[PDB]
Amino acid sequence: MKVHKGDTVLVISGKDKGAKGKVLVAYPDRNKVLVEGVNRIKKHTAVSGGIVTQEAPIHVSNVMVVDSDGKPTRVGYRIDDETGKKVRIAKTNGKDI
Amino acid sequence: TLKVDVKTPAGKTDGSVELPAELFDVEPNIALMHQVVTAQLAAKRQGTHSTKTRGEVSGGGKKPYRQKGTGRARQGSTRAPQFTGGGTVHGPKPRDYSQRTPKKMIAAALRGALSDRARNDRIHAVTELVEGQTPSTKSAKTFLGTLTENKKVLVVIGRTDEVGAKSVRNLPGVHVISPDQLNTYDVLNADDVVFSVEALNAYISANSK
RNA sequence: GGCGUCUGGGGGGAACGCGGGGAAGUGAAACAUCUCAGUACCCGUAGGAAGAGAAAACAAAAUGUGAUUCCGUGAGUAGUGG
RNA sequence: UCCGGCUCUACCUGGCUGGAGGGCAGUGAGAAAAUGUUGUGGUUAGCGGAAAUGGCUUGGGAUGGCCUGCCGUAGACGGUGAGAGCCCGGUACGUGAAAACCCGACGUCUGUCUUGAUGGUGUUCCCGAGUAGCAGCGGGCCCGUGGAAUCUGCUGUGAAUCUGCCGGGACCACCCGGUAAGCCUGAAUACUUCCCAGUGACCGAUAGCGGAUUAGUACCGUGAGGGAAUGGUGAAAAGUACCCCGGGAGGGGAGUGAAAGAGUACCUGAAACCGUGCGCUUACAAUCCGUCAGAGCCCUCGACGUGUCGUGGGGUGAUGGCGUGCCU
């Protein structure tokens, strides 16, 4: 899906346009991902509830995978025909990311 | 008699064609051209529209209640038009829209159209759009920029010369054609028309005999 | 006929097919002959398609055609018909 | 073509019964089974796949406008917080199958003609029998019993084999064509329960399949059988934490949110219908309920002047005249 948990991303669209972020979880069945520090919502939880500021899911087509060189870059797929993997790869450099 | 200069992508001219007089000095008959394009569009149009009348719907084949004594009106099926769920009456049906325009009216249309463009100097010729056997749309686009500035344009390239087709296909305005299926709507919708020389020769020695 | 063994068949299916049976309201400004229709429906069996199919055929003195089937025309004609 | 033996038999011939090189053909309708190679041949999962975090402004959000670049064998389509060729999914294009399945391809395997043919010459024999034909009732052929052939069904009767027989619209003679009563035969043709991919001058929740919602369900009927209704919050639930009235429902503040004239009875939110306020009018009057004249009061625009007529306009409208709903 060109994003996995543990990757790092750059936000495009929203009030939080221009934000780095770490991916925490993804929801591939609906193309949405919960990035850290973005989409802050003041959820009410009643117990002893409280107005608490939590994350919410971006849609995955509002984030570019940050290049290993620290710039927003696309990603693509070579093959290491020996090992038979399909490595996710930037389309500026060609490196392993 | 109108003359055309072939044109090259590399920035030169090869030769000149001396177009016929009778194909390309016909006077247009606007009613004729109207009729024929209307026919083309009609035959394009497919008749996928059908509805279920009173005799194809579900049920209704029982007189729902008495004729008399009830108080209410008289009814013979629960699927008649005036009900809610009932049959369409005079509905659409799957039908054909083609109409049989003759060969002479058609060809008269096409010749008159090509004349309308020729007199106004919108028929350009060309040997090719490309260098050898490798499509590149940037080439054809630059060449049409050299040769033309209008929005829309027609291209007539034969079957074997697939590279020009594959090249110019993706452009916004262009609408490519083979001269064996040369028609009238596709001509008139345009502003300029780019023939290949093979195409002209085929067209002319196919019609003229 | 009884006993043992071996192989088949048995029923379902949306339409399409071939053989058989087989109406009526309707039209005729009535109606029975006729028509609606050999339709609907029912039966028996199929196949991926079926059935027909190699002249005991056409034709008209033309020195002609050459299995069958399905499409266009002939033709709404020659004709048939209370 | 060579021979093995056979023509009852040893011997000359003619004719069989065997094997052999060979040829032909093959899963054919023309006999039938499996065999193993086998084709980037096809189907049954998929995969890569070009190019802008571009600049100013608006806005909650830019995918908009304007200005700058690029790709293009890819500007088809869709989605993404508002119309996205350059975000995403994917397209043009090229790739891909251990196994199974289908096509042919082969070599097996199987037969099969090979012991043979072209022509000569005068006469006997055979050429599909309860049938064809004829008569009686009937069907269907353009043809309704008519002069009515051909094709046929049941009964009854019932012939010949080539100078034979059947047809050429009664029938007879001549000529013509053809050789029934035994059997198989592909391709063109018709069709879609299901499956795959798309198109639409087709519908867009009283439409479209009866069924966008548990749908042949609920409900009805003993039973066969009938047979409905109900789509939309917003960009994401951030779905109102907390307080006050109340038993609770429900609500008011405080909040979220771009907007709560978006609160899980939620896009917009008409009319009928139900009411609350403000102005005029209405309790001595006979009203298809209106229209023409119009007093009086209230609102308004404008020229002016301490309030005031006007080439005015609008709501009500005392009172007078006229006036017998709409359709078929």
Side-chain angles (χ1 to χ4, degrees), chain A residues 1-2 10 12-15 17 32 39 41-47 49-51 57 59-64 71-72 74-77 86 91:
Chain A
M1 39 229 144
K2 295 184 178 195
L10 190 72
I12 294 166
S13 297
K15 302 294 283 182
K17 172 167 180 181
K32 290 192 171 185
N39 301 123
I41 48 168
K42 275 81 76 176
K43 183 171 179 173
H44 299 99
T45 297
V47 184
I51 286 169
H59 188 275
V60 68
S61 60
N62 308 125
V63 305
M64 190 67 70
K71 290 286 282 186
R74 284 82 59 81
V75 303
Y77 294 135
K86 179 181 176 178
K91 288 183 183 292

Side-chain angles (χ1 to χ4, degrees), chain A residues 1 3-5 23-35 54-61:
Chain A
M1 39 229 144
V3 171
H4 310 299
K5 180 174 177 172
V23 180
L24 290 166
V25 301
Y27 301 100
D29 198 1
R30 65 194 190 188
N31 294 113
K32 290 192 171 185
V33 304
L34 191 154
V35 169
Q54 292 178 356
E55 304 293 331
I58 290 289
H59 188 275
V60 68
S61 60

Side-chain angles (χ1 to χ4, degrees), chain B residues 38-172:
Chain B
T38 297
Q40 291 188 358
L41 301 178
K44 169 181 168 180
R45 187 260 192 88
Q46 67 182 358
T48 61
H49 51 83
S50 184
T51 62
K52 288 183 176 181
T53 58
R54 181 181 172 183
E56 309 187 356
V57 302
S58 173
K62 182 258 174 62
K63 183 167 168 68
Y65 56 93
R66 301 178 189 173
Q67 189 68 27
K68 301 177 87 76
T70 57
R72 300 172 76 199
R74 307 175 299 180
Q75 297 298 331
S77 179
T78 65
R79 300 294 186 191
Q82 62 267 11
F83 291 14
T84 290
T88 295
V89 173
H90 295 305
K93 294 288 185 178
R95 54 183 284 181
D96 191 358
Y97 293 83
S98 70
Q99 60 189 2
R100 304 182 73 210
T101 303
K103 297 171 180 177
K104 286 182 184 168
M105 288 171 72
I106 291 159
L110 188 71
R111 280 98 163 101
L114 296 170
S115 298
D116 177 77
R117 292 293 191 277
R119 296 164 183 175
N120 292 305
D121 193 357
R122 300 288 187 83
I123 290 161
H124 299 283
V126 60
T127 184
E128 284 186 350
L129 298 166
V130 287
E131 189 59 24
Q133 303 175 0
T134 185
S136 67
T137 297
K138 186 177 174 183
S139 298
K141 188 179 178 184
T142 314
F143 179 62
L144 296 175
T146 290
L147 177 55
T148 296
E149 56 185 1
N150 307 123
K151 295 185 179 182
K152 296 165 72 175
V153 70
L154 180 63
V155 173
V156 175
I157 289 172
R159 302 289 182 83
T160 295
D161 190 359
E162 299 181 355
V163 296
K166 290 171 76 72
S167 176
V168 77
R169 178 183 287 171
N170 197 5
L171 293 173

Side-chain angles (χ1 to χ4, degrees), chain B residues 2 19 22-26 28 33 107-123 154 156 182-184 186-188 192-195 200 203-204 207:
Chain B
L2 292 168
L19 292 170
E22 294 189 357
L23 306 190
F24 297 165
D25 298 332
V26 178
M33 301 170 86
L110 188 71
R111 280 98 163 101
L114 296 170
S115 298
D116 177 77
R117 292 293 191 277
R119 296 164 183 175
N120 292 305
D121 193 357
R122 300 288 187 83
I123 290 161
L154 180 63
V156 175
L182 186 66
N183 53 8
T184 305
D186 300 330
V187 174
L188 291 172
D192 277 326
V193 178
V194 164
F195 280 100
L200 282 161
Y203 183 85
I204 295 163
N207 289 317

